[PDB]
Symmetry: D2
Amino acid sequence: HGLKEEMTMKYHMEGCVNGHKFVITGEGIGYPFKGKQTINLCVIEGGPLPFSEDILSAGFDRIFTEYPQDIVDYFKNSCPAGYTWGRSFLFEDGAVCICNVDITVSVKENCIYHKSIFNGMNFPADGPVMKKMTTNWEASCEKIMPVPKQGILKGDVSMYLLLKDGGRYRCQFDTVYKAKSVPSKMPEWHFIQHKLLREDRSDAKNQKWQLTEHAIAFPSALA
Amino acid sequence: HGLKEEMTMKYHMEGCVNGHKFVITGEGIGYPFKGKQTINLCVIEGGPLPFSEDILSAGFDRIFTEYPQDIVDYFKNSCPAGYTWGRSFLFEDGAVCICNVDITVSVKENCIYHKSIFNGMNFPADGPVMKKMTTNWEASCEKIMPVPKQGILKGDVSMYLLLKDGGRYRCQFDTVYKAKSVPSKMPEWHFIQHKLLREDRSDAKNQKWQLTEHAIAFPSALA
Amino acid sequence: HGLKEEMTMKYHMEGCVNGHKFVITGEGIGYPFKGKQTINLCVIEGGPLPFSEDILSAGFDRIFTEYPQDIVDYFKNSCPAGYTWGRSFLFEDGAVCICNVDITVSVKENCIYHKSIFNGMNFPADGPVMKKMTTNWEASCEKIMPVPKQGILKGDVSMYLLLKDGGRYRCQFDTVYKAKSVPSKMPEWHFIQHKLLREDRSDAKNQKWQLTEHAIAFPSALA
Amino acid sequence: HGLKEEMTMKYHMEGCVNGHKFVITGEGIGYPFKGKQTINLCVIEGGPLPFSEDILSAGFDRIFTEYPQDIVDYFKNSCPAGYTWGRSFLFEDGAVCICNVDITVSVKENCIYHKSIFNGMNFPADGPVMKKMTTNWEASCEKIMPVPKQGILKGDVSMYLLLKDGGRYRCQFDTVYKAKSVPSKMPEWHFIQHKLLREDRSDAKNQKWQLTEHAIAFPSALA
């Protein structure tokens, strides 16, 4: 579908969180069929961010999911034209974010482009996000489900951002995934398990960090 | 504060709802001290809109609130520099929107400028917003609360959008209002009642409409 | 309708909060047409309660609401047979309660009886409820709406429990009110403003407290 | 822990849903180490129920979960004294239920006893629960999390009840699990996948049905 075992990618995110504007760019290398990716981000406007970077992590691609042969891979089937997705983030302390992403494969470059718009508000000044008290998202299991009359998928995952003191901070992710062309095949409902990690790489020059994700699709374990 | 009994205003909104991009411009006339306004909107890009216009109505100014003398008017006080606000809209069927607005008074024009960004997603294709089945918002009572030590306000109002068949469709609004300069005076908590009405004005050529709002601040009725 | 200007009432509540069982009895005197009541509660089983007594307050009667003559008084019209109500309490930190109440007028004794079942859970051990850090609910405005063709009302109020440190703790109330017998008349939607106050009266032998409420119904102030 | 390869169980549930009171009794057989159970329910008061029986299904035991040897089994370690649990059910259309269950093993009888109290409200008259339009819960993945320093667990699962017309009706479950004796060992966080199936067995004398469940615990799939 215009894809190879190893690919590069590019990222552009513009956002506003609690009224703070920012632009982030980045690049990475991934293995679409192994569901693995490693990416490096740099805050080119609005740095240093007054809020935890961890809230942005999921806003930077389900092409990078190891799918078994007997589950339709809606995301690779959408390539190379690609797909768009929209996601709401509902945090336990009343904060709300929305992210929209447009994904396109460049077959000429073997490179997957990502353009994001990220908007969020109502993070309490004294909460773990504005106080930068977060460390990493916990590993998760997302439910993926088809909307057959519409040729789109929905995702549903209850997420936990782990805190410096050892506590957890919950966020409900609800996602709509939409191929750019009408799919011939639709998957049945299944799960995707994720593990996403951040490592800071900031220095005198820029705020920057590395994200790594490993994702695998699974059917229900029950016969 | 650079305000007069009668003023004009200008509106620019850019947004995206369920992946549909659009731009809307507008102008009107209002009476700040009476808490009354009438505005006319024009869809300039992305029309006709594939969703109900009603979801957008509150995204286009608490300066137009009648305040009694013994309640601090945070919004008028913030003039002529103005203020900003951010709102989440949580609909009963899972849809989520976020709107950010920047408001500033041109004393030389006697005009209030409003620039807004509206994003929304997860409106069901068969729901009243996508099927354009709504008529008007019901009149409402918003609670306004000061945030101690941050010089900002929060707003909380449970809204109902009335449907062509006599139903109601609920949306929870949560707002943060922030003056561009530190306030010297902060209000105690109070209510604001609103009545917001839409009248279509669409050609065979163009999508356009008028909005009127009347808003009044009140303390608790129980003494 | 079996009602007088001054009446007595009786209360029996059984409940479980965070797995703690309790039984509470009470009595009071009220003024139905003036919207005022004072009641006295005594924990006869499960005392002293390991949670804030304030969560229980709204679980012990809209008969005690001053209605203007131009709004239908559904609650008084249901008497003397009475009415039942069911309410969910959704707290900002994830705690959830439900309460069900059965209300009947005894004309022989000029006394309104209240039988309630209160269930709640997921109050965090470190939170204001389990640490008894609450003082009183802030005054409120509830929206009351008729349900076309079911002979019932729905109430919607966003409540705030004031904290010892001066903070607020939010809870969303959603109520279903159901006259025992079919009403001849239904109200249009309106507001009810409430003010509810608690005074501790515990002694050497029982946990005890007094509650007072004043409630008045109003149309929209904008017509 | 007083457990055997094959065991029997007894149930008693008392409840009220939208004001309708009921009593259910039941009996089953199960295989704790294989995570399988089959139970038969009989409505002994308040039959036939005016709501879908499917909302009750999860209210009738995590002892019945196939556990990896390398994950601490909180539930079997609590036996034979047993454990209790509380759960909130937040449906997408605003209905709310709470269930509390007390579980205990009779070693003499090789029998697991369950006593439940189920209360729910705000199911819309025209919704799939009151219109009995549901067929079965879809198979799920619950996240199970230890609570540091309290010796309890929390469960979080986003559940979907399948409808006759092929649609889905969403419910968020949040559970608190509490061993009767303070545990010496706590598990790390993990998943439990479930599949729960209902078959109606109603005759002219009683409303009756069968439930089967298969549940397996898993760690995160990712390294």
